[PDB]
Design an enzyme around this catalytic site. Structure first.
Site, short mmCIF file in Angstrom:
data_model
loop_
_atom_site.label_atom_id
_atom_site.label_comp_id
_atom_site.label_asym_id
_atom_site.label_seq_id
_atom_site.Cartn_x
_atom_site.Cartn_y
_atom_site.Cartn_z
N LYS A 37 20.61 -12.16 50.84
CA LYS A 37 19.80 -13.23 50.24
C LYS A 37 18.88 -12.84 49.29
CE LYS A 37 18.01 -17.62 50.73
NZ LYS A 37 18.71 -19.09 50.98
N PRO A 38 19.39 -12.73 47.96
CA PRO A 38 18.72 -11.77 47.17
C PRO A 38 17.37 -12.41 46.84
CG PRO A 38 20.69 -12.50 46.20
CD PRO A 38 20.56 -13.15 47.29
N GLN A 49 14.51 -15.54 48.23
CA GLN A 49 14.21 -16.49 49.43
C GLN A 49 12.83 -17.14 48.81
OE1 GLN A 49 15.09 -16.81 53.00
NE2 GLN A 49 14.00 -18.64 52.46
N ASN A 59 31.50 -36.53 45.29
CA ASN A 59 31.11 -36.34 43.96
C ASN A 59 30.28 -34.99 43.56
OD1 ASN A 59 30.22 -37.04 41.12
ND2 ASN A 59 28.24 -37.08 41.98
N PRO A 64 29.08 -28.45 64.46
CA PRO A 64 28.40 -29.50 65.31
C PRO A 64 26.76 -29.54 64.73
CG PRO A 64 29.49 -27.96 66.45
CD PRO A 64 29.70 -27.53 65.31
#
Ligand SMILES: COc1ccccc1C(=O)[C@@H]1CCC[C@H]1C(C(=O)O)C(=O)O
Ligand SMILES: COc1ccccc1C(=O)[C@@H]1CCC[C@H]1C(C(=O)O)C(=O)O
EC number: 6.3.3.3
Lengths: 226, 227
Positions: free
Chosen positions: A38-39, A41, A148, A198
Site C-alpha cells: 500500500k504505497p 495511505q 458505468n 458477503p
C-alpha cells in the site's frame, strides 16, 4: 520475477482492502507466498491502516508502505493539506519491484480509484501498473451505477494496455435485491467476476475470514496466478 | 441547427436534472430558446420524471421524451424487467434532430453516467453525442471519489473526440468542508467549472430557482452557447 497484481476500485469505499485480504488469504491457503504493498495511505488521523487490516485478516507479514497522511482525502489533497509532497514515482516502482520474487503473489493496493494521483507529478496506479507490467484486479459494487463506473475503469485500463484480471464485488448484500442481482449478471457479461464477498465479511475473525475467503474464489484461478 | 449539449454525470444521483433545469433557466433569461430532451427515463413506477421536474423548476414547456420504464434501474435491466425493448439509435437521434434548430439550445439529459447503454446494441450517450455533434456538460459531486470519476469520464469523452463543455457541481454545501473545498479546486484544474449549484436548489420555488440559476453561471458563457 513473480506475479504482481494492482488491486484498484471503481471508487472509494468499495472494499478494496477486504478484497486484498480475501485474495491474500485464499492464495496463502493455496500455498502461495503473498506480499501486499500500500504505497500511500490516507485517513490515518481516524485510524485507517489498510496494511494492518490485511495483516489481521489474512496473516500476511510482508506489508510494505511508503507514506501515511492524516486527512481522509485523496493523496494529493491530503499531501497538500499536510504541506508535504507525495512519494516519487521511482520509490513506488522500485519498492514493488523489490517485493516481487518467483513463487510470490504481490498485490499493490491503490488509494481510491484508478486515476487518483499516487506520486509526483500526477502519476497514477495506472502508470505504476504499466511500469511493473502488472495486471489490474477491479473491485466493484453491486449497487446502482456500478456498470458505468466499471466500463469507464476498463476503458481506462485498456487505453494504456493494462490487462484486466477480473472483477470482485467487494460487498454482496443479503438478501441481494433486484438491482444487485441484475448488476451481478451484467458485470459478468463485461468481465470475469472472480468473487462476491458477503457483506459484513470485514468484521470476521481470522478463522472465519479464512474460510470465507477460501470459498469465495475459484481455487484453480487462484492457483494459476503464479 | 442550433447548439446541442448532452448533459451527463459521473454517476447517478449527481444532480443532472437540477443542472438541466438551472442551465435552461439561465439560458431562457438570456433570451435563448431552450428545449430539454430525456430520451430514456427509468423509475417511472416510483414517480421519477425528470422532464416534469425541469418544467416545474425552470418553466420549460419545450420538453421531449421517448422511452419510459417502470423500475428504477439501468435502462437495459428496467426494459428487461418490463418485457420491453430499448429504443433504436435513430429513434434517439431523430428525437434530438427534430428539436434542434437555429437559435435554440437543446439539452439532452442522459440516464445515469456516460457509458450507460441507452439503445441496442451498446449505444451510449457518448455515441449519441458523436452522431449529433454535441459537446458534453459533465455533472459531478464534490465528495470523496469525484476526481477519479471525473477523470474517467473526461478520458472517455476525449477517446471519441466529444468536446467537454465543462463541469457543473450538482450540489455545493454551504459552508463547504475541507474535503469539498479541496475537491472543487482540484476539479477546476481538470476542466472549467461552469457552476456549483447550492445544495437544496431542487426545493426552491420558480422565482428563487430562476434567481439561483441566473447567478450560478457566467452570463457570458451562457450567452455564448448559442449564436
Ligand atoms: C486516496 O484515495 C481516495 C480517493 C478519493 C477519496 C478518498 C480516498 C481515500 O483515501 C479514502 C479515504 C481514507 C481511506 C481511503 C480508502 C482506503 O484506505 O482503502 C480508499 O482507498 O478509498
Ligand atoms: C437508467 O440509468 C441509470 C443507470 C444506472 C443507475 C441509475 C440510473 C438512473 O437513471 C436512475 C435510476 C432512476 C432515476 C434515474 C436518474 C434520473 O432520472 O435522474 C438518472 O438518470 O440518473
Amino acid at each position: 520475477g513473480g506475479t504482481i497484481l494492482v488491486v484498484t476500485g471503481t471508487g472509494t469505499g468499495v472494499g478494496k482492502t477486504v478484497v486484498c485480504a480475501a485474495l491474500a488469504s485464499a492464495a496463502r491457503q493455496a500455498g502461495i507466498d503473498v506480499a501486499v504493498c500500500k504505497p500511500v495511505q490516507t485517513g490515518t488521523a481516524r485510524g485507517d491502516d489498510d496494511l494492518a487490516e490485511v495483516g489481521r485478516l489474512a496473516g500476511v507479514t510482508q506489508l510494505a508502505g511508503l507514506a501515511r497522511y492524516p486527512q481522509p482525502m485523496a493523496p494529493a489533497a491530503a499531501a497538500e493539506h499536510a504541506g508535504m509532497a507525495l512519494p516519487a514515482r521511482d520509490q513506488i516502482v522500485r519498492l514493488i519491484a523489490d517485493l516481487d520474487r518467483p513463487g510470490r503473489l504481490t498485490l499493490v493496493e491503490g488509494a481510491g480509484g484508478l486515476l487518483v494521483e499516487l506520486a509526483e507529478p500526477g502519476v497514477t496506479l495506472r502508470d505504476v501498473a504499466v511500469d511493473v507490467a502488472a495486471a489490474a484486479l477491479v473491485v466493484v459494487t453491486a449497487d446502482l451505477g456500478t456498470l458505468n463506473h466499471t466500463k469507464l475503469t476498463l476503458e481506462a485500463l485498456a487505453a494504456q494496455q493494462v490487462s484486466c484480471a477480473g472483477l470482485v464485488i467487494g460487498s454482496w448484500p443479503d438478501p441481494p435485491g433486484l438491482v444487485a442481482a441484475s448488476n451481478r449478471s451484467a458485470l459478468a457479461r463485461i468481465a470475469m467476476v472472480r468473487a462476491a464477498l458477503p457483506a459484513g465479511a470485514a468484521s470476521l475473525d481470522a478463522g472465519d475470514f479464512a474460510a470465507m475467503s477460501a470459498a469465495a474464489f475459484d481455487r484453480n484461478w487462484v492457483a494459476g496466478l503464479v
